[PDB]
Amino acid sequence: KYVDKIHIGNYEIDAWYFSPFPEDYGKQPKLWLCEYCLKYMKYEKSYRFHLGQCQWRQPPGKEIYRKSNISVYEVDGKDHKIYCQNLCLLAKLFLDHKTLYFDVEPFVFYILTEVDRQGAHIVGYFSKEKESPDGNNVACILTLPPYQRRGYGKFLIAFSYELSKLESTVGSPQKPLSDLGKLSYRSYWSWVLLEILRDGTLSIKDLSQMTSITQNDIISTLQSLNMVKYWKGQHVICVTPKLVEEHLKSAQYKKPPITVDSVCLKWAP
Ligand SMILES: [Cl-]
Numbered sequence: 001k002y003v004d005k006i007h008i009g010n011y012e013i014d015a016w017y018f019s020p021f022p023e024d025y026g027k028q029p030k031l032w033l034c035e036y037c038l039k040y041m042k043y044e045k046s047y048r049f050h051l052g053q054c055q056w057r058q059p060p061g062k063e064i065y066r067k068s069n070i071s072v073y074e075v076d077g078k079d080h081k082i083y084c085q086n087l088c089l090l091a092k093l094f095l096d097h098k099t100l101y102f103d104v105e106p107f108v109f110y111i112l113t114e115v116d117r118q119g120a121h122i123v124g125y126f127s128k129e130k131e132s133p134d135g136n137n138v139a140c141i142l143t144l145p146p147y148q149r150r151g152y153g154k155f156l157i158a159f160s161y162e163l164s165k166l167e168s169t170v171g172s173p174q175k176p177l178s179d180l181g182k183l184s185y186r187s188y189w190s191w192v193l194l195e196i197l198r199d200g201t202l203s204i205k206d207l208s209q210m211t212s213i214t215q216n217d218i219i220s221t222l223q224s225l226n227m228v229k230y231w232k233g234q235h236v237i238c239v240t241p242k243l244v245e246e247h248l249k250s251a252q253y254k255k256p257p258i259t260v261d262s263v264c265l266k267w268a269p
């Protein structure tokens with residue numbers, strides 16, 4: 001028997017996929033997680049004890065972003081092996097194609113939290129290879145189920161590209177994306193490109209430089225917006241500024257409820 005339900009903070013969440021917690025953890029009805037340190041436990045009694053003993057009120061690592069009550073923590077998987085091993089076992093419950101759980105040192109994880117008087121509550125995260133051969137600025141990304149479809153997912157994507165911009169480099173997420181992944185990325189890419197095309201002759205490589213979105217990713221977005229022509233084996237951006245405004249005004253695209261503010265980011269490569 002696999003883990004199939006978890007209790008974390010005040011949420012219970014059913015699992016979507018196999019996650020390789022040790023066998024005897026699968027045995028239990030629920031898995032109980034500390035919402036701050038992410039320690040997993042077998043019983044409500046050990047959960048309650050931990051709750052009253054644990055001193056953590058936020059993720060480990062560095063708070064590299066604070067705007068209002070949204071915070072992002074940078075955790076190095078080398079400096080915090082166990083926390084990150086726990087994060088990965090948690091994420092694998094909802095990510096089908098996540099492969100890495102124990103070998104965490106090559107990764108740095110970015111933790112989205114919303115803060116109240118009690119502490120900083122994890123809402124989602126994305127991991128990133130420290131050095132990427134394939135040029136992936138995200139390895140895995142995930143908004144926890146009860147928080148999905150509220151702009152946290154898109155905040156994370158936005159954020160992963162803000163980091164790429166400060167590294168003066170283009171990047172694409174590791175594939176395959178989930179269906180929620182695909183939709184959120186195509187939506188983010190769309191909004192970013194449309195917003196910019198509103199404000200005069202920019203090549204696709206010019207757009208790639210400004211946004212840190214790869215040329216393939218810009219091309220495939222522009223195709224779905226119907227703003228790219230094919231000429232002699234070359235993708236040519238063909239934009240009618242009325243159809244740009246047309247698109248924006250529509251329902252499909254809009255400022256996410258919540259956005260990355262480059263000012264409130266305290267990070268450098
Ligand atoms: Cl659920």
Ligand SMILES: [Zn+2]
Binds near residue numbers: 035038039050055056
């Ligand atoms: Zn704890």
